[PDB]
Design an enzyme around this catalytic site. Structure first.
Site, PDB file in Angstrom:
ATOM      1  N   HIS A  29       0.841  -1.203   0.000  1.00  0.00           N
ATOM      2  CA  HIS A  29       0.000   0.000   0.000  1.00  0.00           C
ATOM      3  C   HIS A  29       0.863   1.235   0.000  1.00  0.00           C
ATOM      4  CE1 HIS A  29      -4.028   1.903   0.486  1.00  0.00           C
ATOM      5  NE2 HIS A  29      -3.340   2.859   1.142  1.00  0.00           N
ATOM      6  N   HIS A  31       1.936   4.801  -2.950  1.00  0.00           N
ATOM      7  CA  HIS A  31       1.393   5.597  -4.055  1.00  0.00           C
ATOM      8  C   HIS A  31       2.470   6.414  -4.689  1.00  0.00           C
ATOM      9  CE1 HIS A  31      -2.207   5.047  -1.391  1.00  0.00           C
ATOM     10  NE2 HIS A  31      -1.352   5.472  -0.444  1.00  0.00           N
ATOM     11  N   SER A  75      -5.771   9.327  -5.057  1.00  0.00           N
ATOM     12  CA  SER A  75      -7.080   9.904  -5.358  1.00  0.00           C
ATOM     13  C   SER A  75      -6.994  11.240  -6.090  1.00  0.00           C
ATOM     14  CB  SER A  75      -7.956  10.001  -4.099  1.00  0.00           C
ATOM     15  OG  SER A  75      -7.518  11.031  -3.230  1.00  0.00           O
ATOM     16  N   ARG A 128     -18.154  11.987   3.512  1.00  0.00           N
ATOM     17  CA  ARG A 128     -18.722  12.950   2.558  1.00  0.00           C
ATOM     18  C   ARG A 128     -19.015  12.341   1.172  1.00  0.00           C
ATOM     19  NH1 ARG A 128     -13.471  15.013   2.941  1.00  0.00           N
ATOM     20  NH2 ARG A 128     -12.129  14.482   1.163  1.00  0.00           N
ATOM     21  N   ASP A 246       1.835   3.099   3.305  1.00  0.00           N
ATOM     22  CA  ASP A 246       0.956   4.200   2.888  1.00  0.00           C
ATOM     23  C   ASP A 246       1.745   5.425   2.371  1.00  0.00           C
ATOM     24  OD1 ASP A 246      -1.693   5.170   2.351  1.00  0.00           O
ATOM     25  OD2 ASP A 246      -1.508   6.548   4.077  1.00  0.00           O
TER      26      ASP A 246
END
Length: 294
Positions: A29, A31, A75, A128, A246
């Site tokens: 995990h 990015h 994202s 959200r 992460d």
């Protein structure tokens, strides 16, 4: 706007871990962000991050003592998996990936992602976003993925129960990011960990990432609540657990983790050479490099 003007969310001189991972360990995990010059961010991205490209990632990986990476679409790049695909390409076989797709993606495009090294897709159910998410489309796309793909899902503890029917209907294996953010203050037998075990007990093919003490434990390092709450979970599901740094820590600019200390959590949640080997080598090898296994 320049790299310098953008948001740094990582430590630029991380500590050497006190822990040494097994020789073939996988960071499942992480990015890339950009670099923006070749790979721009989604126009819908609110707060733009600094470049954290593949060369930085491999340096980080080497520094921490890992052999391989699973690079998860960030994202801030939305539907556009270009940066991630490029990084997998530069990894010389040392990387696989997770994509974020437009539900309207066709069969040939997914096949192209597969040859690009993608082995699944991600659904990010933020508080959200959960109400506004088109969950039906997510399920349709999930039922027509290339052979042997899985879905990666993030959600919060508050919304687990309302997401149970969606996750039951997912026709492929599932990996839950950060264990669905249980409140680790409650202890290993707390209400969140109880609810999470009921999810795990509902299907044999739900896995989790035992990740992100920085996100889950408000006390900060050494994140003792994370350690005490997560270790029994790792132990009870030894064959269904993977791990990640992460890095570059999207949105963590208010509490930037030292990756050395992140890695040093591993022997706390997996105290034996056996559990370490499962979480860091064999479990991620089974999911992301299945053709290599047996």
């Amino acid at each position: 706007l320049t790299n310098d003007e953008r948001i740094l969310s990582w430590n630029e001189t991380p500590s050497k871990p006190r822990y040494t991972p097994p020789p073939g360990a996988i960071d499942a995990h992480c990015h890339v962000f950009g670099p923006m010059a070749q790979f721009p961010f989604s126009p819908k991205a609110k707060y733009l991050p600094r470049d954290a490209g593949p060369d930085m990632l491999f340096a980080l990986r080497d520094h921490l003592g890992f052999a391989r990476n699973v690079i998860v679409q960030a994202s801030c790049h939305g539907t556009d998996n270009a940066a991630t695909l490029d990084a997998i390409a530069r990894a010389q076989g040392k990387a696989r990936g997770i994509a974020v797709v437009d539900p309207a993606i066709d069969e040939a495009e997914l096949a192209a992602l597969h040859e690009g090294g993608m082995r699944g897709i991600r659904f990010n159910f933020l508080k959200r976003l959960v109400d506004d998410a088109p969950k039906d489309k997510f399920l349709e796309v999930a039922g027509r993925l290339p052979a042997g793909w899985h879905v990666v899902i993030y959600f919060e503890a508050d919304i687990l129960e309302e997401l149970r029917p969606f996750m039951d209907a997912i026709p492929v294996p599932i990996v839950i990011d950060h264990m669905g953010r249980p409140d680790v203050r409650q202890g290993p037998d707390g209400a969140d960990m109880k609810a999470f075990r009921r999810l795990l007990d509902s299907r044999e093919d739900i896995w989790f990432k035992a990740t992100c003490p920085d996100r889950l434990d408000p006390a900060g390092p050494p994140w003792d609540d994370f350690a005490r709450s997560v270790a029994p979970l790792v132990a009870d599901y030894a064959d269904r657990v993977i791990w990640g740094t992460d890095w570059p820590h999207p949105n963590m600019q208010d509490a930037i983790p030292d990756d050395g200390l992140v890695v040093d959590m591993i022997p706390r949640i997996a105290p034996t050479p056996e559990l370490q080997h499962k979480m860091l080598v064999t479990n991620p090898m089974r999911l992301y490099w299945s053709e290599e296994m047996e």
